[PDB]
Amino acid sequence: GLPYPEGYRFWTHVKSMELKPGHPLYESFGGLHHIYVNPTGLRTYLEGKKAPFPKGTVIVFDLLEAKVEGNALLEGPRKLIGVMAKDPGRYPDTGGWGYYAFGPDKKPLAIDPKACHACHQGAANTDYVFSAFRP
Amino acid sequence: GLPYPEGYRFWTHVKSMELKPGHPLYESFGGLHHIYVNPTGLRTYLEGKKAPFPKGTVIVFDLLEAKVEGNALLEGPRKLIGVMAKDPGRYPDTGGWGYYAFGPDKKPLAIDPKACHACHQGAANTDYVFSAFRP
Ligand code: HEC
Ligand code: HEC
Numbered sequence: 001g002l003p004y005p006e007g008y009r010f011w012t013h014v015k016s017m018e019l020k021p022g023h024p025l026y027e028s029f030g031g032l033h034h035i036y037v038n039p040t041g042l043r044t045y046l047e048g049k050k051a052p053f054p055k056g057t058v059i060v061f062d063l064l065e066a067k068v069e070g071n072a073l074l075e076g077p078r079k080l081i082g083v084m085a086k087d088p089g090r091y092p093d094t095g096g097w098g099y100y101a102f103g104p105d106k107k108p109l110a111i112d113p114k115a116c117h118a119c120h121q122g123a124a125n126t127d128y129v130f131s132a133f134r135p
Numbered sequence: 136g137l138p139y140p141e142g143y144r145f146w147t148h149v150k151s152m153e154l155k156p157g158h159p160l161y162e163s164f165g166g167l168h169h170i171y172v173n174p175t176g177l178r179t180y181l182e183g184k185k186a187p188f189p190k191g192t193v194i195v196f197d198l199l200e201a202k203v204e205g206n207a208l209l210e211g212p213r214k215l216i217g218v219m220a221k222d223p224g225r226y227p228d229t230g231g232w233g234y235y236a237f238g239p240d241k242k243p244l245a246i247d248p249k250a251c252h253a254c255h256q257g258a259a260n261t262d263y264v265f266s267a268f269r270p
Contacts, residue, residue, distance in 0.1 A: 009270065010177075013148040013169065018208035026206065034148065042145075071161065073153035073208070075269050134210050135144065 001108055002085055002100045008060040011036040014045060015134040018066050018073065029063060031079055035131045036060040041086070045133040049126040052096075057086035059129065078104040082116070084129070095120070095128045136243055137220055137235045143195040146171040149180060150269040153201050153208065164198060166214055170266045171195040176221070180268040184261040187231075192221035194264065213239040217251070219264070230255070230263045 014035040019026050037045055041057035053059075060083055065076030081102050088096035099116035101109040120128040149170040154161050172180055176192035188194075195218055200211030216237050223231035234251035236244040255263040 010147050012145050013171075016151055016167070016169065016210060018153075020203075020206040020208065023206035032151070032208075034151065036148075068155075071155040071158035073155065073167075075151060 002083060002098055004102055004106045005038075005058050005060055005081075005083055008036050008038070008058070008062070008081070011038050011058075011060070012042050012045075014059075015131050020066075029061075030066075032064045032066040032073065032075060034062045034064075036062065044127075049129060049132070052127040053086045053129065055086050055088060055096075057084075059084045059131075080104070080109060084120075093117075095124065097128055137218060137233055139237055139241045140173075140193050140195055140216075140218055143171050143173070143193070143197070143216070146173050146193075146195070147177050147180075149194075150266050155201075164196075165201075167199045167201040167208065167210060169197045169199075171197065179262075184264060184267070187262040188221045188264065190221050190223060190231075192219075194219045194266075215239070215244060219255075228252075230259065232263055 014037050016032065016034045018032045019030050023030070038058040041053050041059060044051060044053045044057065060081050062081050063079040065079060067074040067076040083100040085098040085100065086096055087098060091098050094113055094117040097117065099111065099113035101111045103109055123130045149172050151167065151169045153167045154165050158165070173193040176188050176194060179186060179188045179192065195216050197216050198214040200214060202209040202211040218235040220233040220235065221231055222233060226233050229248055229252040232252065234246065234248035236246045238244055258265045
């Protein structure tokens with residue numbers, strides 16, 4: 001597999017989004033997520049994903065429970081992290097991306113990377129990455 | 136004043152929070168905010184703010200409109216950034232912190248730094264910083 005991306009918390013914050021109940025992705029990715037990109041990937045995002053992400057790009061989808069307390073949305077406990085790692089050589093079947101997921105204990109989750117990719121094929125125009133950098 | 140903190144977007148993401156209507160800070164800081172700390176300040180946060188932040192610490196409060204569209208919370212347009220810059224020498228009246236605010240055009244806002252500090256005095260125990268680093 002891919003080793004847990006130690007240090008992703010200190011990478012560049014790309015964007016945030018909360019998926020609320022009834023969202024089509026709510027059952028698998030419900031809650032508040034933050035996206036982080038490592039230094040290798042950053043410039044592709046800043047230029048608007050017009051060229052493919054270089055090999056060594058790592059993108060982290062950090063999913064937290066969304067807690068409404070009083071009149072605030074707060075970050076709750078981590079549910080999981082999703083990872084995409086670019087290596088055209090290693091991952092020819094999934095558009096050159098390695099798809100990985102880890103739970104809050106940092107242990108790998110048993111996922112079908114092909115099922116991750118199947119949805120990310122919707123974003124094949126921007127190298128299988130949905131998110132845009134929010135300045 | 137303080138020059139606009141160019142490059143804060145690439146600093147460490149400390150935490151996020153949405154203030155909803157009826158929150159006591161809703162009129163001035165309503166929306167989704169993200170907090171960023173520069174490298175100088177990071178370690179004080181990681182150690183749980185038991186010691187004061189070193190001189191040269193810069194913390195950014197990035198406030199965005201919260202847009203509910205479908206069953207999602209999305210980041211809307213920037214409302215403002217608030218900045219705290221640690222310099223015990225320059226800011227003896229406000230606990231060694233410079234308080235600054237900038238609008239979306241990056242232009243300074245006319246604020247009373249003493250009014251910022253008056254509220255942050257609630258957090259005098261942790262060097263006038265409310266937020267904790269969310270691992
Ligand atoms: C559709 C049914 C999806 C499935 C299955 C998976 N992902 Fe995905 N992913 C999806 C969307 C719509 C987005 C964008 C969210 C946003 O805030 O804009 C994402 C994003 C990611 C990211 C961030 C990179 C990006 O493409 O924007 C990563 C690291 C990611 N997803 C990983 C991932 C993994 C590991 C999956 C299988 C376990 C997976 N995704 C499935 C939509 C869908
Ligand atoms: C209470 C009435 C406040 C006034 C007036 C101001 N601030 Fe503040 N600030 C407040 C809280 C409760 C928090 C924490 C928010 C969170 O998500 O936990 C903040 C935070 C900041 C930050 C981030 C650093 C921190 O203390 O956690 C900055 C950079 C900041 N605030 C700046 C700021 C400025 C420039 C103000 C006057 C224009 C100001 N604050 C007023 C509460 C209050």
